[PDB]
Ligand binder design. Structure first.
Ligand SMILES: NC(=O)c1ccc[n+]([C@@H]2O[C@H](COP(=O)([O-])OP(=O)(O)OC[C@H]3O[C@@H](n4cnc5c(N)ncnc54)[C@H](OP(=O)(O)O)[C@@H]3O)[C@@H](O)[C@H]2O)c1
Length: 324
C-alpha cells in the first residue's frame, strides 16, 4: 500500500516517504530498516541533518543486488546545504552525500534553501555576536552547477526546497534542467494551495515536510492550537478508526501531495504509510481545508527583546517575504 506520482522526468515518486530530520544517529538506522520492511520505498535525507552516514549503513544492508530491496526500486532524496551554494562546492557537496549514503546516484537532489551561508566546513557560520554570516551567491548560479550533476548522471532529478513562487519562476527562466519537485512545509494550517496551484502550473510536484506539524519542531513552545487535537482530525480519526496523524497524512495523499513523515518510533512508522486503504468524502476534505490559516512553524528563533522573529528574514533571497 503505497501509491505514487509521476515526475516530469518519468520517475515514479511514492506519495509517502520516510523523513529523517532530527532522526539522530543510533536511531535512524533501526528506523530505516524497519520502514523498508513495512513498504517504504521513499527516503528523504539531508546533509545538514548530520545522519546520512548512519543512513548509508542501513541501506548498505537492506538495499543492493542481493538484499530484499533492489536499488532501482528505492527513491532516495537529499539536499544541498546553504554553505555549499558556490558552483565549485556543489559537486563536492553532492559527492560527499553519496559517500555517506553509500550510493552511486540520488533520485532527487534539492537546494535546501534559496539563500546561502558563508562557505566552509561550519554548517552554521556565526561570528562574534553569534549572528549568521551569510553569503551572496544567487540561487541561479547554484542551480546551473546543480544541473551539471544530472549531466554526470549523479542525480536523476533536481528540485527546490523552501522556494517561493517568484523564486521558482526565476529558476525556470534559465533552467536547462527543470526542477521536478518543490519541498515545503505543508499541512492543514499551511495548506500551500496557492503555491501548489503554482507548481501544477509549472510542472513541479509538491512534497510536504512537517505534515503532522512537526509535533514540536526543533524549536517551538506556543500553547495552542495543536494540529493533532483539532476536533475535526479527532472526529475523522474516530470515524475511520485511525490515528490523528494518519488523518493528516491521508489528507495530503488524497490531494496528490507527497509527504515524508518523520518517525523513529516502531509503531508509528508502519501507520504513517498505511493511509491508502481509506478515503475522506468531499465534505470532510472541505472541513480539513477550512483549517487553513497561512501559519508556518518551520522558521528561526534568534530571540530579540523577548520576541521571536525570523533570523534570516534580512537575506535578500529570503523566501518568506512574499505571500507565497
Ligand atoms: N526541506 C526542508 O527544509 C526540510 C526541513 C525540515 C524537515 N524536512 C523533512 O521532512 C521530514 C518530516 O518533517 P518533520 O520531521 O519536521 O515533522 P513531521 O513529520 O510532521 O513530525 C515529526 C514528529 O511527529 C512525531 N510522529 C511521527 N509519526 C507520528 C504519528 N503517527 N503520530 C504522532 N506523532 C508522530 C515524531 O515523533 P517520533 O519520531 O518520536 O515518532 C516527530 O516528533 C523530515 O524528517 C525531513 O526529512 C525537510
Amino acid at each position: 500500500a503505497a501509491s505514487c506520482v509521476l515526475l516530469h522526468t518519468g520517475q515514479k515518486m511514492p506519495l509517502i516517504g520516510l523523513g529523517t530530520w532530527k532522526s539522530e544517529p543510533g536511531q535512524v538506522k533501526a528506523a530505516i530498516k524497519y520502514a523498508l520492511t513495512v513498504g517504504y520505498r521513499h527516503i528523504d535525507c539531508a546533509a545538514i541533518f548530520g545522519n546520512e552516514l548512519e543512513i548509508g549503513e542501513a541501506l548498505q544492508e537492506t538495499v543492493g543486488p542481493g538484499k530484499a530491496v533492489p536499488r532501482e526500486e528505492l527513491f532516495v532524496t537529499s539536499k544541498l546545504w546553504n554553505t555549499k551554494h558556490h558552483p565549485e562546492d556543489v559537486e563536492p557537496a553532492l559527492r560527499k552525500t553519496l559517500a555517506d549514503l553509500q550510493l552511486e546516484y540520488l533520485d532527487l537532489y534539492l537546494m535546501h534553501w534559496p539563500y546561502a551561508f558563508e562557505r566552509g566546513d561550519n554548517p552554521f557560520p556565526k561570528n562574534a555576536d553569534g549572528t549568521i554570516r551569510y553569503d551572496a551567491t544567487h540561487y541561479k548560479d547554484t542551480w546551473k552547477a546543480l544541473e551539471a550533476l544530472v549531466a554526470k548522471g549523479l542525480v536523476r532529478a533536481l528540485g527546490l526546497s523552501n522556494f517561493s513562487s517568484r523564486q521558482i519562476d526565476d529558476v525556470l527562466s534559465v533552467a536547462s534542467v527543470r526542477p521536478a519537485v518543490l519541498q515545503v512545509e505543508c499541512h492543514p494550517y499551511l495548506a500551500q494551495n496557492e503555491l501548489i496551484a503554482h507548481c501544477q502550473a509549472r510542472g513541479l510536484e509538491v512534497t510536504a515536510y512537517s505534515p503532522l506539524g512537526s509535533s514540536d519542531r526543533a524549536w517551538r513552545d506556543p500553547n495552542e492550537p495543536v494540529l493533532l487535537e483539532e476536533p475535526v482530525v479527532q472526529a475523522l480519526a474516530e470515524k475511520y478508526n485511525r490515528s490523528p496523524a494518519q488523518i493528516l497524512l491521508r489528507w495530503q495523499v488524497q490531494r496528490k501531495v507527497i509527504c515524508i513523515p518523520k518517525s523513529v518510533t516502531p509503531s508509528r512508522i508502519p501507520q504513517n504509510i498505511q493511509v491508502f486503504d481509506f478515503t475522506f468524502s468531499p465534505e470532510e476534505m472541505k472541513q480539513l481545508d477550512a483549517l487553513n490559516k497561512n501559519l508556518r512553524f518551520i522558521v528561526p528563533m534568534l530571540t530579540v527583546d523577548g520576541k521571536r522573529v525570523p533570523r534570516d528574514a534580512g537575506h535578500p533571497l529570503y523566501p518568506f517575504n512574499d505571500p507565497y
